[PDB]
Design an enzyme around this catalytic site. Structure first.
Site, PDB file in Angstrom:
ATOM      1  N   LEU A 224     -25.087  49.295 -29.226  1.00 51.42           N
ATOM      2  CA  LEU A 224     -26.492  49.620 -29.441  1.00 51.42           C
ATOM      3  C   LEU A 224     -27.239  49.812 -28.132  1.00 51.42           C
ATOM      4  O   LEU A 224     -28.334  50.378 -28.105  1.00 51.42           O
ATOM      5  CB  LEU A 224     -27.165  48.528 -30.267  1.00 51.42           C
ATOM      6  CG  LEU A 224     -26.547  48.361 -31.650  1.00 51.42           C
ATOM      7  CD1 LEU A 224     -27.251  47.275 -32.437  1.00 51.42           C
ATOM      8  CD2 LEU A 224     -26.597  49.683 -32.397  1.00 51.42           C
TER       9      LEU A 224
ATOM     10  N   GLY B 134     -26.870  47.685 -20.441  1.00 46.92           N
ATOM     11  CA  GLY B 134     -27.651  47.612 -19.222  1.00 46.92           C
ATOM     12  C   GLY B 134     -26.806  47.159 -18.051  1.00 46.92           C
ATOM     13  O   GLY B 134     -25.573  47.239 -18.083  1.00 46.92           O
ATOM     14  N   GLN B 135     -27.476  46.661 -17.019  1.00 49.68           N
ATOM     15  CA  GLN B 135     -26.823  46.269 -15.776  1.00 49.68           C
ATOM     16  C   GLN B 135     -25.899  45.047 -15.917  1.00 49.68           C
ATOM     17  O   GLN B 135     -24.807  45.022 -15.345  1.00 49.68           O
ATOM     18  CB  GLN B 135     -27.888  46.004 -14.713  1.00 49.68           C
ATOM     19  CG  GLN B 135     -27.362  45.893 -13.299  1.00 49.68           C
ATOM     20  CD  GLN B 135     -28.473  45.671 -12.300  1.00 49.68           C
ATOM     21  OE1 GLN B 135     -29.651  45.649 -12.662  1.00 49.68           O
ATOM     22  NE2 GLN B 135     -28.108  45.504 -11.036  1.00 49.68           N
ATOM     23  N   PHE B 136     -26.336  44.036 -16.668  1.00 42.83           N
ATOM     24  CA  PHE B 136     -25.514  42.841 -16.851  1.00 42.83           C
ATOM     25  C   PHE B 136     -25.259  42.497 -18.319  1.00 42.83           C
ATOM     26  O   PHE B 136     -24.638  41.475 -18.619  1.00 42.83           O
ATOM     27  CB  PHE B 136     -26.132  41.641 -16.136  1.00 42.83           C
ATOM     28  CG  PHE B 136     -26.409  41.875 -14.677  1.00 42.83           C
ATOM     29  CD1 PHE B 136     -25.394  42.277 -13.818  1.00 42.83           C
ATOM     30  CD2 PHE B 136     -27.684  41.683 -14.164  1.00 42.83           C
ATOM     31  CE1 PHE B 136     -25.649  42.491 -12.471  1.00 42.83           C
ATOM     32  CE2 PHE B 136     -27.946  41.893 -12.820  1.00 42.83           C
ATOM     33  CZ  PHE B 136     -26.925  42.295 -11.973  1.00 42.83           C
ATOM     34  N   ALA B 137     -25.721  43.355 -19.227  1.00 39.36           N
ATOM     35  CA  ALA B 137     -25.572  43.093 -20.657  1.00 39.36           C
ATOM     36  C   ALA B 137     -25.163  44.323 -21.454  1.00 39.36           C
ATOM     37  O   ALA B 137     -25.516  45.448 -21.106  1.00 39.36           O
ATOM     38  CB  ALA B 137     -26.853  42.514 -21.228  1.00 39.36           C
TER      39      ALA B 137
ATOM     40  N   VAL C 225     -24.952  45.425 -25.734  1.00 38.30           N
ATOM     41  CA  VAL C 225     -25.348  44.978 -27.065  1.00 38.30           C
ATOM     42  C   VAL C 225     -24.534  45.701 -28.136  1.00 38.30           C
ATOM     43  O   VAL C 225     -24.451  46.932 -28.133  1.00 38.30           O
ATOM     44  CB  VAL C 225     -26.849  45.190 -27.305  1.00 38.30           C
ATOM     45  CG1 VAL C 225     -27.222  44.757 -28.703  1.00 38.30           C
ATOM     46  CG2 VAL C 225     -27.668  44.416 -26.277  1.00 38.30           C
TER      47      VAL C 225
ATOM     48  N   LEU D 177     -30.943  42.315 -35.933  1.00 35.70           N
ATOM     49  CA  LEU D 177     -30.550  43.719 -35.819  1.00 35.70           C
ATOM     50  C   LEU D 177     -31.726  44.663 -36.077  1.00 35.70           C
ATOM     51  O   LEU D 177     -32.393  44.567 -37.102  1.00 35.70           O
ATOM     52  CB  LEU D 177     -29.422  44.030 -36.806  1.00 35.70           C
ATOM     53  CG  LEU D 177     -28.965  45.492 -36.874  1.00 35.70           C
ATOM     54  CD1 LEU D 177     -28.364  45.921 -35.548  1.00 35.70           C
ATOM     55  CD2 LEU D 177     -27.965  45.706 -38.010  1.00 35.70           C
TER      56      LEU D 177
ATOM     57  N   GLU E 269     -34.346  53.272 -30.024  1.00 33.85           N
ATOM     58  CA  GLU E 269     -35.462  53.049 -29.113  1.00 33.85           C
ATOM     59  C   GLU E 269     -36.659  53.952 -29.394  1.00 33.85           C
ATOM     60  O   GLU E 269     -36.505  55.099 -29.824  1.00 33.85           O
ATOM     61  CB  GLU E 269     -35.020  53.245 -27.658  1.00 33.85           C
ATOM     62  CG  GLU E 269     -34.042  52.201 -27.143  1.00 33.85           C
ATOM     63  CD  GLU E 269     -33.531  52.525 -25.747  1.00 33.85           C
ATOM     64  OE1 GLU E 269     -34.006  53.521 -25.155  1.00 33.85           O
ATOM     65  OE2 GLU E 269     -32.654  51.784 -25.247  1.00 33.85           O
TER      66      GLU E 269
ATOM     67  N   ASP F 281     -41.401  43.256 -19.060  1.00 37.58           N
ATOM     68  CA  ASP F 281     -40.519  44.430 -19.104  1.00 37.58           C
ATOM     69  C   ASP F 281     -40.874  45.371 -20.254  1.00 37.58           C
ATOM     70  O   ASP F 281     -39.995  45.968 -20.881  1.00 37.58           O
ATOM     71  CB  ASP F 281     -39.042  44.001 -19.171  1.00 37.58           C
ATOM     72  CG  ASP F 281     -38.083  45.076 -18.640  1.00 37.58           C
ATOM     73  OD1 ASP F 281     -38.536  45.989 -17.916  1.00 37.58           O
ATOM     74  OD2 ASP F 281     -36.870  44.993 -18.934  1.00 37.58           O
TER      75      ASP F 281
ATOM     76  N   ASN G 290     -37.722  49.400 -24.506  1.00 41.47           N
ATOM     77  CA  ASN G 290     -37.720  48.033 -25.019  1.00 41.47           C
ATOM     78  C   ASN G 290     -38.557  47.830 -26.284  1.00 41.47           C
ATOM     79  O   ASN G 290     -38.954  46.711 -26.606  1.00 41.47           O
ATOM     80  CB  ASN G 290     -38.125  47.042 -23.918  1.00 41.47           C
ATOM     81  CG  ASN G 290     -37.016  46.816 -22.924  1.00 41.47           C
ATOM     82  OD1 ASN G 290     -35.847  47.059 -23.230  1.00 41.47           O
ATOM     83  ND2 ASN G 290     -37.366  46.351 -21.727  1.00 41.47           N
TER      84      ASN G 290
ATOM     85  N   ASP H 225     -35.674  42.644 -25.496  1.00 42.00           N
ATOM     86  CA  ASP H 225     -35.334  42.427 -24.087  1.00 42.00           C
ATOM     87  C   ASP H 225     -36.230  41.417 -23.374  1.00 42.00           C
ATOM     88  O   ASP H 225     -37.194  41.783 -22.689  1.00 42.00           O
ATOM     89  CB  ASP H 225     -35.279  43.748 -23.312  1.00 42.00           C
ATOM     90  CG  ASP H 225     -34.655  43.588 -21.936  1.00 42.00           C
ATOM     91  OD1 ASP H 225     -34.195  42.472 -21.609  1.00 42.00           O
ATOM     92  OD2 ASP H 225     -34.609  44.587 -21.188  1.00 42.00           O
TER      93      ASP H 225
ATOM     94  N   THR I 284     -39.164  48.005 -14.088  1.00 37.98           N
ATOM     95  CA  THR I 284     -39.057  49.450 -13.906  1.00 37.98           C
ATOM     96  C   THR I 284     -40.328  50.043 -13.288  1.00 37.98           C
ATOM     97  O   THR I 284     -41.403  49.954 -13.890  1.00 37.98           O
ATOM     98  CB  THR I 284     -38.790  50.127 -15.267  1.00 37.98           C
ATOM     99  OG1 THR I 284     -37.583  49.597 -15.832  1.00 37.98           O
ATOM    100  CG2 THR I 284     -38.649  51.622 -15.109  1.00 37.98           C
TER     101      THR I 284
HETATM  102  O1  LIG Z   1     -31.309  44.673 -26.445  1.00 40.96           O
HETATM  103  C1  LIG Z   1     -31.103  45.573 -27.262  1.00 40.96           C
HETATM  104  C2  LIG Z   1     -30.868  46.886 -26.865  1.00 40.96           C
HETATM  105  C3  LIG Z   1     -30.817  47.282 -25.525  1.00 40.96           C
HETATM  106  C4  LIG Z   1     -31.453  48.463 -25.130  1.00 40.96           C
HETATM  107  C5  LIG Z   1     -31.416  48.891 -23.802  1.00 40.96           C
HETATM  108  C6  LIG Z   1     -30.719  48.120 -22.875  1.00 40.96           C
HETATM  109  O2  LIG Z   1     -30.629  48.461 -21.561  1.00 40.96           O
HETATM  110  C7  LIG Z   1     -30.077  46.948 -23.267  1.00 40.96           C
HETATM  111  O3  LIG Z   1     -29.414  46.241 -22.307  1.00 40.96           O
HETATM  112  C8  LIG Z   1     -30.116  46.527 -24.590  1.00 40.96           C
HETATM  113  C9  LIG Z   1     -30.655  47.844 -27.845  1.00 40.96           C
HETATM  114  O4  LIG Z   1     -30.673  47.569 -29.180  1.00 40.96           O
HETATM  115  C10 LIG Z   1     -30.931  46.291 -29.583  1.00 40.96           C
HETATM  116  C11 LIG Z   1     -30.970  46.002 -30.940  1.00 40.96           C
HETATM  117  C12 LIG Z   1     -31.226  44.706 -31.347  1.00 40.96           C
HETATM  118  O5  LIG Z   1     -31.272  44.437 -32.678  1.00 40.96           O
HETATM  119  C13 LIG Z   1     -31.440  43.701 -30.402  1.00 40.96           C
HETATM  120  C14 LIG Z   1     -31.402  43.997 -29.039  1.00 40.96           C
HETATM  121  C15 LIG Z   1     -31.139  45.296 -28.626  1.00 40.96           C
END
Ligand SMILES: O=c1c(-c2ccc(O)c(O)c2)coc2cc(O)ccc12
Length: 275
Positions: free
Chosen positions: A18, A21-24, A26, A94, A99, A137, A142, A159, A178
């Site tokens: 879904l 990112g840089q350290f995560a 999903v 979820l 986005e 953020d 987000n 986020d 950002t």
């Molecule tokens: O956190 C997320 C992100 C997400 C979007 C952009 C990013 O750079 C990232 O690291 C994570 C995308 O979809 C989601 C859906 C969810 O139900 C919960 C958290 C997220």
């Protein structure tokens, strides 16, 4: 604080990615015991004290503590936390409609459509700021839609990786998001509070109405310089048929002095928003 150290795959099955990112990263997932679906956020842990890859435990613990406080229709919720040697895994609510950023790339919006999102964003931020939580953020990437195929999509703020509790009215750490969305106080490394979120909301509002970013430069640093100088204007080509009241709303948020900037409560009472 420690988290559940059983293998997450013994309790969940993962699916579509879904976000990354840089350290995560999903991943959509499904709890075996209930059939219920969630989003699993895999956050890479720091491997050494002074390392610079991965997220510090202090930062992960702050994020989890903040997420645990939250229950509101316009903000993402936390279901469970797991960990192992490599990652902390947040089992989050979820949200499957993608986005706001990608949504905006399909459709500029009308003022009614813009205010449809904004009001939900403002309600969510009102909740957070009432709990002295600064998000730090806020941006279209987000904000997530529940269902992007309805006339009036419902949204959730996600986020919380930079979020902080502001128990003294201001905070003084390494916090920097950002460039297009950060307030001048962040650019100038000054004490930060709830006000920084309100600036970001002004930027979001400008983008919703025009499809353009108000401070965007050719480079990271030029954007930052534009932000600090409050170098933005309402282009006639974009705003010729936008109400002056909508411009007024944005104008009262894009204010350099945080103490002169509209608060979340001010924004909800502003004539453009208030019913
Ligand atoms: O956190 C997320 C992100 C997400 C979007 C952009 C990013 O750079 C990232 O690291 C994570 C995308 O979809 C989601 C859906 C969810 O139900 C919960 C958290 C997220």
């Amino acid at each position: 604080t420690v988290f559940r150290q059983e293998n997450v795959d013994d309790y969940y099955d993962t699916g579509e990615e879904l976000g990354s990112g840089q350290f995560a990263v999903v991943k959509k997932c499904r709890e075996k015991s209930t059939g219920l679906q969630y989003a699993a956020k895999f956050i890479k842990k720091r491997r050494t004290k002074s390392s610079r890859r991965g997220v510090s435990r202090e930062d992960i613990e702050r994020e989890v503590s903040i997420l645990k406080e939250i229950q509101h229709p316009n903000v993402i919720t936390l279901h469970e936390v797991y960990e192992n040697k490599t990652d902390v895994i947040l089992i989050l609510e979820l949200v499957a409609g993608g986005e706001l950023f990608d949504f905006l790339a399909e459709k500029s919006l009308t003022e009614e459509e813009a205010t449809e999102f904004l009001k939900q964003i403002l309600n969510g931020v009102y909740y957070l700021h009432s709990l002295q939580i600064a998000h730090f953020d806020l941006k279209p990437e987000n904000i997530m839609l529940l269902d992007r195929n309805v006339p009036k999509p419902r949204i959730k703020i996600i986020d919380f990786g930079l979020a902080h509790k502001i128990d003294f009215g201001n905070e003084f750490k390494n916090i920097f998001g950002t460039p297009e969305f950060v307030a001048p106080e962040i650019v100038n490394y000054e004490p930060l509070g709830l006000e920084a979120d309100m600036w970001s909301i002004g930027v979001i509002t400008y983008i919703l109405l025009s499809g353009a970013s108000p401070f965007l430069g050719d480079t990271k640093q030029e954007t930052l310089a534009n932000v600090s100088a409050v170098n933005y204007e309402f282009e006639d080509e974009y705003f010729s048929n936008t109400s002056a009241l909508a411009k007024d709303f944005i104008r009262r948020l894009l204010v350099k002095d945080p103490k002169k900037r509209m608060t979340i409560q001010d924004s909800l009472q502003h004539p453009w928003i208030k019913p």
